[PDB]
Amino acid sequence: NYLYRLFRKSKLKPFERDISTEIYQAGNKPCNGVAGPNCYSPLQSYGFR
Amino acid sequence: GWIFGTTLDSKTQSLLIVNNATNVVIKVCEFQFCNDPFLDVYANNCTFEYVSQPFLMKNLREFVFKNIDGYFKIYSKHTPINLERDLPQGFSALEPLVDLPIGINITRFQTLLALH
Structure with a gap:
């Protein structure tokens, strides 16, 4: 039920909020909304046990 | 008034300070309907709201x-x-x-118009 961001293009300014969810791209091939090759979701679960 | 934001396409956050002739002037909420309006003189969530004296x-x-x-x-x-x-x-x-x-993330700002 809790999410964190581990993928971003640039660093975060102090006292700022980023709630947008888009598929991150780190290559020349565009993702185009598809989480396929070279496409990662920045929102990852904690998974507390 | 001035509409502050980055892209306004329901992805980044935007700020919506507006001044009118009434006492309640400022209404800051996430919106994307306001592109280029003119006054008739005759989404998601609201992060912060504030009402004070008119400014101009x-x-x-x-x-x-x-x-x-x-x-x-x-x-x-x-x-x-x-x-x-x-x-x-x-x-x-x-x-x-x-x-x-x-x-x-204030990157681009607009200016309002009022026509008869």
């Missing part, structure tokens, strides 16, 4: 806007210009009126 009470007005550590500082001054040709000489120091507590 030979009528040269000067405002400067600042963005330091997520804080929106606004300064203002009224200057009684005599000859309206260009920006006059002399000095007139601007004074603080309203300090907003929050603002995130």
Whole structure:
């Protein structure tokens, strides 16, 4: 039920909020909304046990 | 008024300070409907809302806007210009009126219009 961001293009300014969810791209091939090759979701679960 | 934001396409956050003739002027919520409106003179969530006195009470007005550590500082001054040709000489120091507590990623700003 809790999410964190581990993928971003640039660093975060102090006292700022980023709630947008888009598929991150780190290559020349565009993702185009598809989480396929070279496409990662920045929102990852904690998974507390 | 001025519409502050980054892209306004329901992805980044935007700020919506607007001034009217009534007492309740400022209404800051996440929206994307306002692209280029004109006044008729006859989404997601609201992060922060604020209501105060109207702001724009030979009528040269000067405002400067600042963005330091997520804080929106606004300064203002009224200057009684005599000859309206260009920006006059002399000095007139601007004074603080309203300090907003929050603002995130202000990149592009607009200006409102009012037509008959």
